[PDB]
From a paper:
The [name]/3 complex regulates many cellular processes by stimulating formation of branched actin filament networks. The [name]/3 complex is evolutionarily conserved and built from two actin related proteins ([name] and [name]) and five other protein subunits (ARPC1-5). When activated by a nucleation-promoting factor such as WAVE or WASP, the [name]/3 complex is unique in its ability to assemble branched actin networks by stimulating new filament growth from the side of existing actin filaments. However, in mammals, [name], ARPC1 and [name] are present as two isoforms – [name], Arp3B, [name], ARPC1B, [name] and ARPC5L – that share 91, 67 and 67% sequence identity, respectively.
To investigate how general these observations are for cryo-EM-determined reconstructions of [name]/3 complexes, we also calculated the 3D reconstruction of human [name]/3 complex containing [name] and [name] subunits. In the [name]/3-C1A-C5 structure, density corresponding to the helices of [name] is clearly visible (right), as is the N-terminus of the subunit that extends to contact the barbed end cleft of [name] (right). The overall conformational similarity of these two isoform-specific complexes – which have been shown to have very different actin assembly promoting activities both in vitro and in cells – implies that the isoform-specific differences observed are not mediated by fundamentally different architectures of the complex, but rather by alternative regulatory effects conferred by isoform-specific residues. To test this idea, we engineered [name]/C5L protein hybrids, in which their N-terminal regions were swapped, and tested their actin nucleation activity in the context of the lowest activity [name]/3-C1A complex. We therefore suggest that while the C-terminus of [name] is closely associated with the body of [name]/3, the role of its N-terminus is to contribute to regulation of complex activation: when contacting [name], the complex is held in an inactive conformation, while priming of the complex involves release of these contacts and conformational restraints between the subunits.
Numbering used by the authors:
A (entry chain B): 9 to 35, 83 to 95, 108 to 114, 138 to 376
B (entry chain A): 3 to 39, 51 to 354, 359 to 413
C (entry chain D): 1 to 284
D (entry chain G): 9 to 30, 35 to 151
E (entry chain F): 4 to 168
Write the structure that this text describes.
Amino acid sequence: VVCDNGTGFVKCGYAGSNFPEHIFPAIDDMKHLWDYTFGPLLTEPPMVAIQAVLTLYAQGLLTGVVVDSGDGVTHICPVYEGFSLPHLTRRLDIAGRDITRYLIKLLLLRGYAFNHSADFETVRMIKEKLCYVGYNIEQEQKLALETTVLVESYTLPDGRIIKVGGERFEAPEALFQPHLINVEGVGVAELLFNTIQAADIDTRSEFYKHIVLSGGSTMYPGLPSRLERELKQLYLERVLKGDVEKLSKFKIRIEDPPRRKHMVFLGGAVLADIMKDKDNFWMTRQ
Amino acid sequence: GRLPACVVDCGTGYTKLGYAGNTEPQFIIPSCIAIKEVMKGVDDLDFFIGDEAIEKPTYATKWPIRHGIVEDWDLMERFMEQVIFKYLRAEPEDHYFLLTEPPLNTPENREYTAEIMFESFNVPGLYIAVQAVLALAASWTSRQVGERTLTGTVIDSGDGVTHVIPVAEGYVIGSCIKHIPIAGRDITYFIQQLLRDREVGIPPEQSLETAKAVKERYSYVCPDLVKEFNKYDTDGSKWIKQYTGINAISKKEFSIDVGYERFLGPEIFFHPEFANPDFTQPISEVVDEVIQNCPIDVRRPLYKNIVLSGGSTMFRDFGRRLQRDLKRTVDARLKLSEELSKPKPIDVQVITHHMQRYAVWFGGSMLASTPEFYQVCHTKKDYEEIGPSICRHNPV
Amino acid sequence: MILLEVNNRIIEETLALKFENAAAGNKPEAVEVTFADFDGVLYHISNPNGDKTKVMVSISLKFYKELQAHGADELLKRVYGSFLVNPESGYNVSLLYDLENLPASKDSIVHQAGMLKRNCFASVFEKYFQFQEEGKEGENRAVIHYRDDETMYVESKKDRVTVVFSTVFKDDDDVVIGKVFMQEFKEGRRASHTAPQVLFSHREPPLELKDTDAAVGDNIGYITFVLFPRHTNASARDNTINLIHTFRDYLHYHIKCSKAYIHTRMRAKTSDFLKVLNRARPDA
Amino acid sequence: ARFRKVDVDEYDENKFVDEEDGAGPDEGEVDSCLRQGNMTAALQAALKNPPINTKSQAVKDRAGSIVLKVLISFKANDIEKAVQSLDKNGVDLLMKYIYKGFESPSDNSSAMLLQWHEKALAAGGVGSIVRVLTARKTV
Amino acid sequence: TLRPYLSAVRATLQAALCLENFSSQVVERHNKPEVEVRSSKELLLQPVTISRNEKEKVLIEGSINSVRVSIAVKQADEIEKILCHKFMRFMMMRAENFFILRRKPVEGYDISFLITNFHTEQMYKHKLVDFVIHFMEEIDKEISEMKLSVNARARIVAEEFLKNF
Ligand SMILES: Nc1ncnc2c1ncn2[C@@H]1O[C@H](COP(=O)(O)OP(=O)(O)OP(=O)(O)O)[C@@H](O)[C@H]1O
Ligand SMILES: Nc1ncnc2c1ncn2[C@@H]1O[C@H](COP(=O)(O)OP(=O)(O)OP(=O)(O)O)[C@@H](O)[C@H]1O
């Protein structure tokens, strides 16, 4: 059976499967997880099979760059052929919980009596349906203040209906700004650009045409398109050097598979042919 | 600047009004406007409010603020007109305004209020505060507190519906507020019935009037019903009182006896079966339950600082009896705990002070006397340049 | 109310309540109230030295030197005789009422305590009315800066007294409404032929004051009040001053009430639109 | 940000490009008819060879003037008959010029133009207006 | 001439209010009013103006899934100008309830509507057309009544003060 342990979500199932038969985070404590998971091969992230190979495997690829964003962390793992490249790969601190928490504060300022503890899951879903980053602020704010269509209605569990407009794009943004974040980054896009650029100069174009997304945090609508637009501007800005012509030539493609939410699991499951005795292998089972 | 910002606290029954810096309100007036039966015009200009608006009976009394919500916005707007130009006598362009509001008002209602204040009265600055937060701040003047904190539990009982609200850092936790139906008015009706069935010679159409006075003059909380009943049945000469009012009809004096209602009136919270038949469940458990619905991590300070607001809380020894009963409920839960079973249970207090009656107004005056108030207000220029985002939200 | 009050209502209800509690025989509770009035006027009502049986009323005004230059002292001393004590530090005038020595007619002192601002303005008017009745012409005009950006001009002529207000309308749209009010004022003689004549000039002073440093601008308005013997003669005086010193605030009140009324009408119509739309919205 | 200031979409090969290429009705002819009081004849001439293909607004603004000149010269009661003398194509083209006219009001020009709209609508239906809306090549 | 103009506006609205649901071609899983975003030129129709005179006119801008309608309202003098500005602003502040209204007018107009396929699906399009016409007629009547009101109250106010001397 394939078990994919994530910080905020555990995907376990069988082989040559489809989607996890179970998606439930495990409650020493890791050993405790066995009691509620196994009871009524192994997968390891870049601290047996490197998920980068896995995510890519399910895609029928060996080379490429994997952008995996989950609950606790976000990585950019470039995989060359079968193996991964433990050296290029970079990490994003940037976050799910924080945005959900920020959306709650923003809705509170609007005048909705939300509680950070009691309503955390409810607002998480409003973020999971309405609320993510935008290309620019001044334009977004105009759309929010000038058309009705920002301004989307959302039915709370008790039947009341609230409205969400500018906060839809306002929550990612803290995180961007250096102002409020008090740390200096990029993002994710600029982070992706650097990873590929700092790589070779031959299979670099190879990576660019095989960027694959994985994890739930990569399911917010428009992400793939935003990444592309940001990469085209970054390419234009640096390697292209402002030449209109050098743009037409470039090859760009961000693979965003429908079942990318659990792309690691989907991979992992059908990797895994059966050894006849389980029995004899391990030291312990030995 | 130079002047004290106007503080207007529009309540369900009584509106508290005055100028910042003052210890007590300059007016306490009934929150209904007596109107005729549009009427442009001369019909317009004609109005009464307070005592005048009440006084004629015939000419219909409205609740300009009922449940903390404006009944009709047009009539509420007219109310604010005379509140400013007849009673306060403030030139509105020279005074910042502090208004107050009850929890659960929607942002739309806030924009309607601000629209009125800015587009009609051209005020230089406006702040709309939630009643509970200033009332908590108002309690910082009490000797029983030594350090300032803006985390606590407010028991807001008005004349329409009492609300129990835990508040953390200035924002009401909307999902944990609870309402209890019963208020000053229920007390009046039941005691009214109580007098009708026992005392004789009381003309019906002025029954409430009399009723209000007896409650205002003789009601109290007793510690135990049966011992107290025995007290009245034993030492009647120094426990039974007499009240004398004048009959609004025939201009003659009526004298009534005042007995059991004295302790039975305020008693009714305590045993909720009193007040309505539907209320199974006492005040100690509801307040405890409310506190128990908020995050466990923040259930430390809330138990240490329960503050009272509104007149319905000015009955002698209300807080003491409440504190005892709550201690019994908390101790019983931690008793169950221990047996099943550690960390020690937090001490439980109820803050009382001398300004409990209109704690809300007092808090308004105290905050509006500081420079910060001038810092956080919305200016008319910002209203014009930004529009409607600004006035909905609190100061950055 | 509707006509502005000479009488300060907060002062009247507060002192009437205090005398009634005294007369009933209750012990007095402390009172400490600080509040304002129009034209930067500040009042304070307190218990001097914490003695709750004594009530002090103090007034502090910016005006004051200019009014003092025109006869104020004689009138205030004439009216308040004895009640009058050394002014409290921080204030210009203080009145002290002893609750243990109240007069038989309390309403008259409640009224006079209300009068206070009006009685402060009265002397300048009384002075120029005397001048007018005696024919002493050519006297320098009084210029009273009653507000930071408002100015008052008083002039006596052969057969009339002119009172000029240089007022400022800070919010643009009230100017537009105000022109309608002043136009209605210009035609006021079509209903009251024996009424004081009124003129109005917008953004430019009247010619008689053109030689001074008078303000000019889009938010300035000049109002002239022409007072005939019937308003300046002996009975006339008190009623005249009572109305003339509240006129400016009366105008600002009615502009605001007109805008308020328009909001109520407009609100009713928007509610009707919402009803039509919902009629229009499909039932299912 | 800077790199975000450029609208890369303007160079997107997958966009849509209109088919464009590279004079108007005969001014002298329209004048002849008008001078002779032949209004219907002037209308039919003004509607000939419209500059549906030129790039410059000068030539388009020229034909619109000629057409507008004619519509204004008309007598109220004689509008219906002229409109009825046109074929469906003429009615559709007339509607385009009428809307054009609505953009240059002067004196009572819109007053008579509303009369033309009414009659043209009666002849071509709302469909003729629909065709003002989705024309890619217009007056 | 008030009747005729409205006839021409009405017919144009009938032509423009022929909308359908259109998923975004530019952004994945987005659905946006094409007349507002304008990222696909082929989806935009030719803007047309109907004018009654130099001052009163209606601008109608169509697209495959939305129509923007802007009106320049009759304002004969200063008081009509301010009354109109205040009334349009009042309605615009309430745009969430009056769900076919834009929150700000197109530059050069007093009030603007944004009508999308979602509106034409849940409301009879012919009644939407009737509504715009009704609105144009009624705002004019209300502005006139407002004007009479202010003037009427002003006379009583001048009279009440003056008669008391
Ligand atoms: N449909 C969706 N659209 C956008 N975001 C989503 C969606 N579903 C879930 N998310 C977000 O994804 C986050 C968790 O993603 P997921 O559970 O796939 O990764 P994980 O397994 O928890 O983390 P990891 O494996 O990296 O430790 C949640 O915080 C949630 O807000
Ligand atoms: N010492 C007292 N004993 C009994 N009742 C009192 C006392 N002090 C005040 N009250 C009562 O409180 C009532 C007014 O209550 P309160 O001021 O809370 O209503 P409100 O302010 O209009 O309500 P809210 O502002 O919460 O909407 C009065 O009717 C009066 O009977």
